[PDB]
Design a binder for these strands. Structure first.
Ligand SMILES: [Mg+2]
Ligand SMILES: [Mg+2]
Ligand SMILES: [Mg+2]
Ligand SMILES: [Mg+2]
Ligand SMILES: [Mg+2]
Ligand SMILES: [Mg+2]
Ligand SMILES: [Mg+2]
Lengths: 130, 136
RNA sequence: GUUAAGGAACUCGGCAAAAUGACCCCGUAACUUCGGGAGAAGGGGUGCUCUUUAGGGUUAACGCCCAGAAGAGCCGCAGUGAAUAGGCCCAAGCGACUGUUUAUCAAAAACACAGGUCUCUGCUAAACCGUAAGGUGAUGUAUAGGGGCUGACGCCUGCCCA
RNA sequence: GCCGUCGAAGGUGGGACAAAUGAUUGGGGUGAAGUCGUAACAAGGUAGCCGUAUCGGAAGGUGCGGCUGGAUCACC
RNA sequence: AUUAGCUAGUUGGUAAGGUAACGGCUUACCAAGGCAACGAUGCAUAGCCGACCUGAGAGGGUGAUCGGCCACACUGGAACUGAGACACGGUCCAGACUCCUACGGGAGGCAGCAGUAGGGAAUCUUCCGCAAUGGGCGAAAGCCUGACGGAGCAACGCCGCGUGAGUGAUGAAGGUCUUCGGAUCGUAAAACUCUGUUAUUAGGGAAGAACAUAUGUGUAAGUAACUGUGCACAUCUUGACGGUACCUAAUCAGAAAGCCACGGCUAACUACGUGCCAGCAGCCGCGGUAAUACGUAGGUGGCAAGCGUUAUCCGGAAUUAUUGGGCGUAAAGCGCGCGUAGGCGGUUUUUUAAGUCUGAUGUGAAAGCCCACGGCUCAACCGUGGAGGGUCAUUGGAAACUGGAAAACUUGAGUGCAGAAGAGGAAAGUGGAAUUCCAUGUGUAGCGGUGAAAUGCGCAGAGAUAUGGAGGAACACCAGUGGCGAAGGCGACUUUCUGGUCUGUAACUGACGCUGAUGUGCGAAAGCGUGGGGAUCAAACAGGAUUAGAUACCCUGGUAGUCCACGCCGUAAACGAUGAGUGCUAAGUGUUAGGGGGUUUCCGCCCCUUAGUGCUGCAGCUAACGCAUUAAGCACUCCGCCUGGGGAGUA
RNA sequence: UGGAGAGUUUGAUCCUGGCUCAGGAUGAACGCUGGCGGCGUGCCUAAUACAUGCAAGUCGAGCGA
């Protein structure tokens, strides 16, 4: 059946960018309400709402493009999927494209970016890349 | 494949085999050193003066020496160079490497330190054949 | 009846004799129709006296018969001390088996056999005994009766109808 | 000095696993094709192929099922 | 794992004995367990770590000198003394070997330091010696020290270093190439000029040696610096190597340089001899009358006191791929269901800290690689510092996800109710049309078969032709892209019994899931076993010709088999050549069974929503073909398999 | 801190795919040549019988004689 839907959200990030859609209506929860509101403060999405009912409330996504109708999000890569777990080192997590992107870690403090982990040296699960 | 399966059976890699079979292993002990390992070199003892041909399209003639090695087993050979001061049952040093387009011959008889000692007729390619010149 | 050293050298041939033999234990191969092989083979122990303890039935119970364990000890060359009681193993040949045969020179590899087929018989059946009457087959009726060949089981049974 | 428990080596016997070897024997690759036929690839001149039987010197041939990886006009 | 069971004092209590102690540690009655698909047991190969090798790293291969630990002493047991040996150089015994005795007996154990013998393609002096550091003994001088301080020998490995340079045009002699009308090496050589690291001449001559001993006068017991010390010095003393390391002064640039290659790769070309020959070869191969790819001289290139060849190992090889692959046709998706362990599991809040995170301590000893420096004249090596181990134990904080624990949630999955469509099975009847064989007539010389013909049945009345009755088997027309079952598959009709799927949803407890290594159950036909029944078609089989030859192909004949009941065997181009499960992303055009908006116009119509079913076609992916909402697209989970072609799905 | 490639199936291609070479190593052997100052490492194959040498003693302020 549907195992780990966190990848299925990040699948539909890639689906709408590829055929250049605008509106994305997926169900999401408080795990994923913590997810997409990272990149809105990083420059990938126009606006992220809040989930309506916190269980069955769909989180609508309106994607951000360029002025030339040029694509902002290049691609996405899961890292720690069910069957192989990846956890970050102290200061030794790797960089996305020599630092030009967001690597999403959910440390012992909550979902942060890989930039915010180098002020407190934490590890946590390296969930996805950009 | 799947990381579950890779735990249950690892990557048992590809075995290879020696290109030259009849040397370099612990063989068949029989309360003495009945047969042994020769990693680069050995002695020999000869059995036959050899004359043969290549077989593919080629039509030349070749001069091997079918021997019995110092570990009970049977191999062919070849004498590089010109001279042949060899007869049946004379000691010959060995060194490996097959000869292409001959159907079954195995190694090279070392022209330096054996009864195959020194080959005259060569003056420039020298240490591949064991020829001296003490002027230079 | 016994015999020194040797043990089939005897001889058509281990022919006759000699060894093995009971009960209680450990252990047992190839091969197969899964039952068998198997008592396979090769091995050990046994006598008398004395001390303790656990075992049925009979009986109110002393009493009586049935038994098995360890331990300690004694004696002889030898302890089922006399008589009675399998020698075993490897590989082939023919017949599957138990059976039966030449009373009185032949006990088998011959005869039977369970099974396979082939043919004949619609009932007052065919077949056989009897010149006939009468009977057997049968108070049975094609899953049953008489005859010819082969001889469990396994895999099979090839061409010729002048 | 003698008696007893435990105890290497030795002797006896039936097994178990590899290895060396053996009269003949059955396929296999290698060559160089001399010997006998053309079974595939064109509709290869009987369309091929996969299972499964039975026969023949030699590829192979026929039977019953499935497949197109079956030309013509793709078999209307 | 082409090895699945395994130990029996084995597993346990109890008892007393037993060694430094626990102890089936060895024995005795009872007791029914140990281990195991998470690899128990049994075979062949092996000393193991710190480190060495290669690599971008992750990893692969190795176990030598050098340190820590371990075992063993020609072979197999057993002891004794002492603080803590089953004792290498001791010891009693037993075995196979050497050799002597008076043949009664005894002796011998160089895997100590070397040297000889021996299988070998292969590894060295039978060297003086205790001065330094370390060890036994003694209160000290000292004593034995094959530990060791060092030398004798091999390019064995790395390092450093020379065989010289400054000056020195007329292409001097002269080689093979050439119109040899000529070039090349080549200021090279021939000379001229300095130098002497190195050495063909001997010698002064190490810091490495601090001490000990006492004696020079100090530490307390100084009573007593005699004693343990030598806490003034340790000063009448301690160097085989060593007339060494070093270094000056001399006739002399004079003794001191190779080796492999030179088509393409791959760094480096020319002229003849031989001319598919003597050869050569890492592959393409260059060789049938020279041939830039064979020997030769010239020429060049490489490295350099060293150059090539071999056998072996790692990289090249993303060619076992966790970092870093693949399955439609190229190697690779089980023939397909139910399914145990196992793997993975939606959402919510609250704890727990088991993973994960970071803090703290202790430890994973020297020595190597690296990060640095006085010095050996640099350097190889030494010296000091530095980084380098945890998948660990334990010692606090954090609660984000994965996980045990408390509570409710309803999209997934299941039932209830309302409804249809079916060749989905399994027993029992029943019906029609064609094939074959028997009964009679009318009837009669042909029926067949074919590229052509026959073999054969017929004239004894065959086929043709009619009624007749005997059997057995398939199931025309509907029938089509349709339907159904997980697959193999299932098409005449009626009846009793019997599974699953779907449409619409008010109901219902409330994650009850997906995948499945072994296990287990169905499997097209052919084939086999024991019984029935046997029309047609028909392997095997006999026949005629086609064929030089013919089971072949073609023709009339023909048995096992085909059908049923029962028990087996389980394979196929068992195919969509595409494993299952969930979500996802441009659209047009059919068709079948159902539901949504109409007076429901009836197979009129358009308007929609859901599930199977076919076609055409963007982005994307693909070697290309071609898929392309029923993906071969983007992702997640779990299972199966592949690693050149034969040998071979064989032994 | 730092990570290369070339050749070969066809008349000619793209792909899958093997095999082969260049490089680093050796307590290596063996082939030719030979100046060394200086530093290291030299039974890895029959566990094939081991001459001749030296490797465990010390204590004469134990105590005898
Ligand atoms: Mg017997
Ligand atoms: Mg027997
Ligand atoms: Mg009568
Ligand atoms: Mg099929
Ligand atoms: Mg010693
Ligand atoms: Mg020494
Ligand atoms: Mg059938």
């Amino acid at each position: 059946t549907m195992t780990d839907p966190i990848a299925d959200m990040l699948t539909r990030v890639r689906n709408a960018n590829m055929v250049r859609h605008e509106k994305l209506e997926l169900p999401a929860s408080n795990i994923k309400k913590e997810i997409a509101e990272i990149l809105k403060s990083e420059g990938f999405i126009k606006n992220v709402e809040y989930v309506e009912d916190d269980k069955q409330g769909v989180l609508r996504l309106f994607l951000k493009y360029g002025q030339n109708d040029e694509r902002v999000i290049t691609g996405l890569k899961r890292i720690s999927k069910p069957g192989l777990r990846v956890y970050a080192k102290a200061s030794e997590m790797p960089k996305v494209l020599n630092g030009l992107g967001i690597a999403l870690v959910s440390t012992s403090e909550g979902v942060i970016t890989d930039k915010e982990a180098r002020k407190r040296n934490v590890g946590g699960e390296i969930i996805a890349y950009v | 494949p799947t990381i579950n399966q890779l735990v249950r059976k690892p990557r048992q890699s590809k075995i290879k085999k020696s290109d030259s079979p009849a040397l370099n292993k612990g063989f068949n002990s029989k309360k003495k050193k009945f047969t042994d390992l020769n990693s680069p070199q050995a002695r020999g003892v000869c059995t036959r003066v050899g004359t043969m041909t290549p077989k593919k399209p080629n039509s030349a003639l070749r001069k091997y020496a079918r021997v019995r090695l110092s570990n009970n087993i049977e191999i062919n050979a070849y004498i590089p160079g010109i001279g042949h001061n060899l007869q049946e049952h004379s000691v010959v040093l060995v060194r490996g490497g097959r000869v292409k387009d001959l159907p079954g011959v195995r190694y090279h008889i070392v022209r330096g330190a054996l009864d195959t000692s020194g080959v005259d007729g060569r003056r420039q390619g020298r240490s591949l054949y064991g020829t001296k010149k003490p002027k230079n």
